[PDB]
Amino acid sequence: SGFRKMAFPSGKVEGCMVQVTCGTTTLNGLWLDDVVYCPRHVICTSEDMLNPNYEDLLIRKSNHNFLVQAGNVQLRVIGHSMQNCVLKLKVDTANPKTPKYKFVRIQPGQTFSVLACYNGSPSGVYQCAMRPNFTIKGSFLNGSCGSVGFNIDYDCVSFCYMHHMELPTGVHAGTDLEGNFYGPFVDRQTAQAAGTDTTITVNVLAWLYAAVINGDRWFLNRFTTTLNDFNLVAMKYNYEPLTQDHVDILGPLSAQTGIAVLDMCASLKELLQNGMNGRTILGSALLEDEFTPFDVVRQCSGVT
Amino acid sequence: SGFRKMAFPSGKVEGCMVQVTCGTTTLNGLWLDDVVYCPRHVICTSEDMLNPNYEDLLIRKSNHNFLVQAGNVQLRVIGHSMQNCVLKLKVDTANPKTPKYKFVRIQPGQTFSVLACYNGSPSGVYQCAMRPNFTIKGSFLNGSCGSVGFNIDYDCVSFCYMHHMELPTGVHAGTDLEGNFYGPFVDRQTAQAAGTDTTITVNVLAWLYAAVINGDRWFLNRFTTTLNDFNLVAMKYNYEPLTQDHVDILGPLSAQTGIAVLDMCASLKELLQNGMNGRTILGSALLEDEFTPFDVVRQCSGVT
Numbered sequence A, B: 001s002g003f004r005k006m007a008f009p010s011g012k013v014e015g016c017m018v019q020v021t022c023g024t025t026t027l028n029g030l031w032l033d034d035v036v037y038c039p040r041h042v043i044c045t046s047e048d049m050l051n052p053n054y055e056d057l058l059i060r061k062s063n064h065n066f067l068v069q070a071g072n073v074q075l076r077v078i079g080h081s082m083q084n085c086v087l088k089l090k091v092d093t094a095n096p097k098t099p100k101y102k103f104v105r106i107q108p109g110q111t112f113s114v115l116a117c118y119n120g121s122p123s124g125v126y127q128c129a130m131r132p133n134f135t136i137k138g139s140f141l142n143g144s145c146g147s148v149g150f151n152i153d154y155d156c157v158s159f160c161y162m163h164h165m166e167l168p169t170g171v172h173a174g175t176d177l178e179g180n181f182y183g184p185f186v187d188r189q190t191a192q193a194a195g196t197d198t199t200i201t202v203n204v205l206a207w208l209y210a211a212v213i214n215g216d217r218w219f220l221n222r223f224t225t226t227l228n229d230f231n232l233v234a235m236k237y238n239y240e241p242l243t244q245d246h247v248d249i250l251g252p253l254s255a256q257t258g259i260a261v262l263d264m265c266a267s268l269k270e271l272l273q274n275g276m277n278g279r280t281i282l283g284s285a286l287l288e289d290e291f292t293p294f295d296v297v298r299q300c301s302g303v304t
Ligand SMILES: Cc1ccnc(C)c1NC(=O)Cc1cccc(Cl)c1
Pocket: A041, A049, A140, A141, A142, A143, A144, A145, A163, A164, A165, A166, A167, A186, A187, A188, A189, A190, B001
């Protein structure tokens, strides 16, 4: 029993973190096999960041300008290339601590763990969701650039995020491991609009099922609804429209609890229209959307 | 910017986790140097747990009855001893992945990271506080026994908790690494009272300072209070009494923000008496007490 915002064990990712320095800028890199991946803005000075011409800036750099250090040992850079917003520094040594890994581009609403790093050293780990608007509400300071997000399936780490930037609004933007930004963002010191965000409906429902499994049941009611009626309420409260694909993914939790998905939707509808009346659910006074249906089943079944 | 319930990177602790089996019971052990530490109730059957005589049960066991497996390799047990509620199994091999470590008994109100494990395999990591009543509100299922809590200072892991039991109320009880329970709990299948819990006042104040640093300032007011007046409010709302020792530990955050500790106490007083009026602080609709003043300074300064 109990329900926590649990992160994946970060060990396999800690063994990949390195420090990358170019000129006067230092950030984090990810060392997998004989390649170090890092945000391409490591090649910028503060003056460059206003409107950088990355192609021109990278041409002034040679392999010996990229200083890569793994803990205390220096890596020898034998190649460099830019792929979208990431730099790939080929090194002469394969990382002996490289776990089994994949590069994945996650969908909005999916969750992942972030290993926050500074100067190539891990400081902490936390779980978060990629917002529907492709931002993440992380905890990152200057120097955290290059910190990565990931999921783990037994022995395989799927890297899904690399941190690049903090928007003027204090929310975070980054790329997949091929350097493609999530969202409309560009790696430039300019004010950039993050779209209207919404609450991840399927995750809130998954978390209400986790609440029932763990004993918090006060919000269950004698009502039911339809997908259409529920979506009228979801639109009014800036929630993502619920689809049959979302209902299908909630099936295991519906089966485990015996509460039909549309009955849980009716509980959520009443919570949206009436608030929590000063009560809590799983220690929260708001509707939590950072747990996917997969996360709930994993945490509630003890998958290692 | 941003503020998350961040856990320490779990890598150094993952390398210590082992599976311990005795008879038909399997749980987690902590392998440090040539000793494996685990909850002594690994020697019990379900029938024994009602009122176990651990001394008598342990006498029926020999070194060869304790099966210790580190991933896929079997450890050879050359000694066994009970210290309070933990068993110490001496093995013939020192753990090559033993980090620099200490065993510490933490105070109520302090925080730590938990690496939840099943069958000696890490499933997730989360941050939590030891409640004033010496329970923890974790996320643990059957088989999580032996999972540990810890803090990390640069390269040193201070182990402070080992999970033993879930109380009938769904909250968790465990020991320090010398096997001494935190709180009045006994390792027995009996209903056990956890005392009245309170909110960790100094942590809520630390978190209000983190909110100010990160831009959430709506709760700041034009008022101040005294320790005496604040403590009358704290008593009414089941908050721990604030002392000058607590004020002194909040000094760095008071200096960083320019908000005197008693002025922050007046904001907290108004939040206690008036609620949050449907607003949030750092993404929470309640007053958070799982961040110590040290945690706030660490997260806000990027200590690795
Ligand atoms: C200051 C800070 C705080 C938290 N995370 C981060 C990542 C930062 N740093 C930046 O955003 C620097 C920067 C400026 C403009 C564009 C880009 Cl790609 C990077």
